Protein backbone atom coordinates (compact mmCIF):
# COMPACT_ATOMS: atom_id res chain seq x y z
CA UNK A 1 0.00 0.00 0.00
CA UNK A 2 2.18 2.86 -1.31
CA UNK A 3 1.15 6.52 -1.48
CA UNK A 4 -0.29 7.50 -4.85
CA UNK A 5 1.68 9.31 -7.52
CA UNK A 6 1.35 13.07 -6.98
CA UNK A 7 1.59 15.77 -9.65
CA UNK A 8 1.76 19.39 -8.39
CA UNK A 9 2.47 22.66 -10.21
CA UNK A 10 5.76 24.26 -9.10
CA UNK A 11 5.92 27.23 -11.47
CA UNK A 12 4.66 28.22 -14.91
CA UNK A 13 5.29 25.24 -17.17
CA UNK A 14 6.94 23.15 -14.45
CA UNK A 15 5.35 20.38 -12.43
CA UNK A 16 6.78 18.19 -9.67
CA UNK A 17 5.94 14.50 -9.86
CA UNK A 18 6.31 12.46 -6.71
CA UNK A 19 6.39 8.68 -6.59
CA UNK A 20 7.07 6.38 -3.62
CA UNK A 21 8.89 3.12 -2.98
CA UNK A 22 9.83 1.15 0.12
CA UNK A 23 13.63 0.96 0.44
CA UNK A 24 14.98 -1.05 3.41
CA UNK A 25 16.40 1.24 6.11
CA UNK A 26 14.55 4.34 4.89
CA UNK A 27 10.90 3.17 5.00
CA UNK A 28 8.78 4.69 2.23
CA UNK A 29 10.93 7.08 0.18
CA UNK A 30 9.31 9.94 -1.73
CA UNK A 31 11.07 10.69 -5.03
CA UNK A 32 10.54 14.02 -6.77
CA UNK A 33 11.08 14.60 -10.51
CA UNK A 34 9.77 17.26 -12.89
CA UNK A 35 7.60 17.60 -15.92
CA UNK A 36 8.52 20.61 -18.11
CA UNK A 37 5.95 21.91 -20.62
CA UNK A 38 6.88 23.77 -23.73
CA UNK A 39 4.24 24.50 -26.35
CA UNK A 40 1.85 21.64 -25.70
CA UNK A 41 4.77 19.16 -25.28
CA UNK A 42 6.06 17.54 -22.07
CA UNK A 43 9.54 16.49 -21.02
CA UNK A 44 9.98 14.15 -18.04
CA UNK A 45 12.88 15.01 -15.76
CA UNK A 46 13.42 11.64 -14.15
CA UNK A 47 10.95 8.78 -14.31
CA UNK A 48 9.04 7.30 -11.38
CA UNK A 49 10.26 4.06 -9.77
CA UNK A 50 7.81 1.87 -11.74
CA UNK A 51 6.17 1.32 -15.10
CA UNK A 52 2.79 1.78 -13.45
CA UNK A 53 3.54 5.25 -12.11
CA UNK A 54 5.32 6.24 -15.33
CA UNK A 55 2.15 5.35 -17.26
CA UNK A 56 0.02 7.27 -14.77
CA UNK A 57 2.28 10.29 -15.19
CA UNK A 58 2.28 10.10 -19.00
CA UNK A 59 -1.49 9.66 -19.14
CA UNK A 60 -2.19 12.64 -16.88
CA UNK A 61 -0.35 14.91 -19.34
CA UNK A 62 -1.62 13.16 -22.48
CA UNK A 63 -5.22 13.55 -21.31
CA UNK A 64 -4.58 17.30 -20.84
CA UNK A 65 -3.43 17.81 -24.45
CA UNK A 66 0.31 17.28 -24.09
CA UNK A 67 2.52 15.18 -26.28
CA UNK A 68 5.35 13.43 -24.39
CA UNK A 69 8.53 14.45 -26.19
CA UNK A 70 11.06 12.59 -24.05
CA UNK A 71 12.45 11.77 -20.64
CA UNK A 72 15.88 12.43 -19.20
CA UNK A 73 17.24 10.44 -16.22
CA UNK A 74 19.59 12.15 -13.71
CA UNK A 75 21.35 8.97 -12.66
CA UNK A 76 21.10 5.20 -13.06
CA UNK A 77 19.23 4.35 -9.85
CA UNK A 78 15.65 3.09 -10.35
CA UNK A 79 14.22 6.19 -8.61
CA UNK A 80 15.28 8.08 -11.79
CA UNK A 81 15.24 5.33 -14.47
CA UNK A 82 12.38 2.99 -13.43
CA UNK A 83 10.17 4.20 -16.29
CA UNK A 84 12.71 3.92 -19.15
CA UNK A 85 11.48 0.38 -20.06
CA UNK A 86 7.91 1.54 -20.29
CA UNK A 87 8.74 4.68 -22.23
CA UNK A 88 10.94 2.76 -24.70
CA UNK A 89 8.06 0.29 -25.12
CA UNK A 90 5.75 3.18 -26.14
CA UNK A 91 8.41 4.56 -28.51
CA UNK A 92 8.81 7.69 -26.38
CA UNK A 93 12.41 8.94 -26.61
CA UNK A 94 14.53 8.43 -23.48
CA UNK A 95 17.81 10.17 -22.62
CA UNK A 96 20.60 9.45 -20.22
CA UNK A 97 24.29 10.26 -20.18
CA UNK A 98 26.82 7.80 -21.57
CA UNK A 99 27.92 7.17 -18.01
CA UNK A 100 24.38 6.41 -16.85
CA UNK A 101 23.77 4.01 -19.76
CA UNK A 102 26.97 2.13 -18.99
CA UNK A 103 25.96 1.75 -15.33
CA UNK A 104 22.48 0.56 -16.44
CA UNK A 105 24.05 -1.96 -18.91
CA UNK A 106 26.37 -3.22 -16.22
CA UNK A 107 23.40 -3.72 -13.87
CA UNK A 108 21.35 -5.67 -16.45
CA UNK A 109 18.95 -2.74 -16.90
CA UNK A 110 17.39 -1.39 -20.02
CA UNK A 111 19.21 1.66 -21.35
CA UNK A 112 17.98 5.01 -22.58
CA UNK A 113 17.58 5.19 -26.35
CA UNK A 114 19.49 8.49 -26.61
CA UNK A 115 22.72 9.40 -24.87
CA UNK A 116 24.96 12.39 -24.44
CA UNK A 117 28.16 13.42 -22.80
CA UNK A 118 30.21 16.44 -21.87
CA UNK A 119 29.91 19.03 -19.13
CA UNK A 120 26.63 20.34 -20.51
CA UNK A 121 24.04 19.15 -22.98
CA UNK A 122 21.03 21.10 -24.21
CA UNK A 123 18.11 18.68 -24.25
CA UNK A 124 16.04 21.58 -25.56
CA UNK A 125 17.95 24.58 -26.91
CA UNK A 126 17.67 27.61 -24.52
CA UNK A 127 15.13 25.79 -22.29
CA UNK A 128 16.43 22.54 -20.74
CA UNK A 129 20.12 22.15 -19.96
CA UNK A 130 21.72 19.03 -18.57
CA UNK A 131 24.86 19.66 -16.45
CA UNK A 132 27.46 17.16 -15.16
CA UNK A 133 29.12 18.49 -12.02
CA UNK A 134 31.32 15.39 -11.59
CA UNK A 135 30.80 12.30 -9.43
CA UNK A 136 29.03 12.50 -6.08
CA UNK A 137 25.93 10.56 -5.03
CA UNK A 138 26.77 8.33 -7.97
CA UNK A 139 29.51 8.36 -10.62
CA UNK A 140 27.08 9.58 -13.30
CA UNK A 141 24.81 12.05 -11.46
CA UNK A 142 23.63 15.00 -13.55
CA UNK A 143 21.38 17.98 -12.84
CA UNK A 144 18.83 19.75 -15.07
CA UNK A 145 18.58 23.54 -15.32
CA UNK A 146 15.59 25.47 -16.59
CA UNK A 147 17.10 28.87 -17.42
CA UNK A 148 13.78 30.77 -18.01
CA UNK A 149 12.31 30.06 -14.56
CA UNK A 150 15.78 29.61 -12.92
CA UNK A 151 14.87 26.20 -11.56
CA UNK A 152 17.55 23.58 -10.90
CA UNK A 153 16.54 19.95 -10.62
CA UNK A 154 19.29 18.62 -8.36
CA UNK A 155 18.04 15.06 -7.93
CA UNK A 156 20.08 12.94 -5.54
CA UNK A 157 23.19 15.11 -5.89
CA UNK A 158 21.53 17.79 -3.68
CA UNK A 159 21.76 16.44 -0.15
CA UNK A 160 21.43 19.43 2.16
CA UNK A 161 20.74 17.50 5.44
CA UNK A 162 23.00 14.47 5.01
CA UNK A 163 24.45 12.47 2.13
CA UNK A 164 22.17 9.39 2.39
CA UNK A 165 23.10 6.14 0.63
CA UNK A 166 26.89 6.03 0.08
CA UNK A 167 26.83 2.62 -1.65
CA UNK A 168 27.48 4.09 -5.11
CA UNK A 169 28.94 7.42 -3.99
CA UNK A 170 32.31 9.05 -4.70
CA UNK A 171 33.04 10.70 -1.39
CA UNK A 172 36.49 11.92 -2.50
CA UNK A 173 35.11 13.71 -5.58
CA UNK A 174 31.78 15.05 -4.20
CA UNK A 175 33.14 18.21 -2.62
CA UNK A 176 34.85 19.26 -5.90
CA UNK A 177 31.68 18.43 -7.84
CA UNK A 178 29.52 20.37 -5.36
CA UNK A 179 31.82 23.44 -5.51
CA UNK A 180 31.52 23.39 -9.31
CA UNK A 181 27.73 23.08 -9.14
CA UNK A 182 27.49 25.98 -6.64
CA UNK A 183 29.65 28.13 -8.89
CA UNK A 184 27.58 27.29 -11.94
CA UNK A 185 24.01 27.70 -10.61
CA UNK A 186 24.27 30.16 -7.69
CA UNK A 187 21.65 32.17 -9.62
CA UNK A 188 19.03 29.42 -9.10
CA UNK A 189 15.69 30.65 -7.68
CA UNK A 190 14.52 27.14 -6.85
CA UNK A 191 16.51 23.97 -6.24
CA UNK A 192 14.53 20.72 -6.30
CA UNK A 193 16.09 17.76 -4.50
CA UNK A 194 14.90 14.17 -4.87
CA UNK A 195 13.73 13.35 -1.32
CA UNK A 196 13.03 16.60 0.54
CA UNK A 197 11.28 19.94 0.00
CA UNK A 198 12.10 22.52 -2.66
CA UNK A 199 14.48 25.24 -1.50
CA UNK A 200 16.49 28.09 -2.90
CA UNK A 201 20.20 28.38 -3.86
CA UNK A 202 21.22 27.77 -0.20
CA UNK A 203 20.74 24.03 -0.91
CA UNK A 204 23.86 24.21 -3.07
CA UNK A 205 26.00 25.46 -0.16
CA UNK A 206 24.41 23.03 2.29
CA UNK A 207 25.21 20.15 -0.09
CA UNK A 208 28.83 21.29 -0.42
CA UNK A 209 29.11 21.43 3.39
CA UNK A 210 27.67 17.94 3.76
CA UNK A 211 30.08 16.60 1.12
CA UNK A 212 33.11 18.17 2.86
CA UNK A 213 31.97 16.84 6.24
CA UNK A 214 31.48 13.36 4.72
CA UNK A 215 34.91 13.33 3.13
CA UNK A 216 36.55 14.49 6.39
CA UNK A 217 34.79 11.67 8.23
CA UNK A 218 35.92 8.94 5.75
ZN1 LIG B 1 20.21 7.52 -6.15
ZN1 LIG C 1 17.79 8.86 -3.77
d(CA 70, CA 216): 40
Cβ atoms 31, 21 nearer than 8 A: yes
What was the resolution (in A) of this experimentally determined structure? Answer: 1.9
Domain 2-218 classification at class level: alpha beta
From CA 41, how far away is CA 89, in angstroms rounded? 19
CA 108 to each of CA 91, 102, 103, 205: distance values in angstroms, whole numbers, following the listed order? 20, 10, 9, 35
Length of the chain: 218
Using the mean position of ligand 1's atoms as its centre, give its distance from the Cα of residue 157 in Å.
Answer: 8
Judge contact between 170 and 131, C-beta under 8 A.
Answer: no
Domain boundaries, the chain: 2-218
Looking at all shown ligands, the one closest to residue 136's CA atom is: 1
**Structure obtained using:** X-ray
What's the gap in Å between 77 CA and the centre of ligand 1? 5
Distance 165 CA to ligand 1 centre (A): 7
- Contact predicate 133/177, CB 8 Å: yes
Nearest-CA neighbor of 81 among 147, 138, 151, 145? 138
Question: How much distance in Å is there from the Cα of 82 to the middle of ligand 1?
Answer: 12
- Give CA–CA dist 173/135, Å, rounded: 6
Amino acid sequence: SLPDLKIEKLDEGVYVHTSFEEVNGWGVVPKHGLVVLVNAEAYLIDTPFTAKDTEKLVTWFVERGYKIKGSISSHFHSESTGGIEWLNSRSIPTYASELTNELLKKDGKVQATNSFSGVNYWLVKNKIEVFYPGPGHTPDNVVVWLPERKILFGGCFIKPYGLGNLGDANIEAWPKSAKLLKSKYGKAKLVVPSHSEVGDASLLKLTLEQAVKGLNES
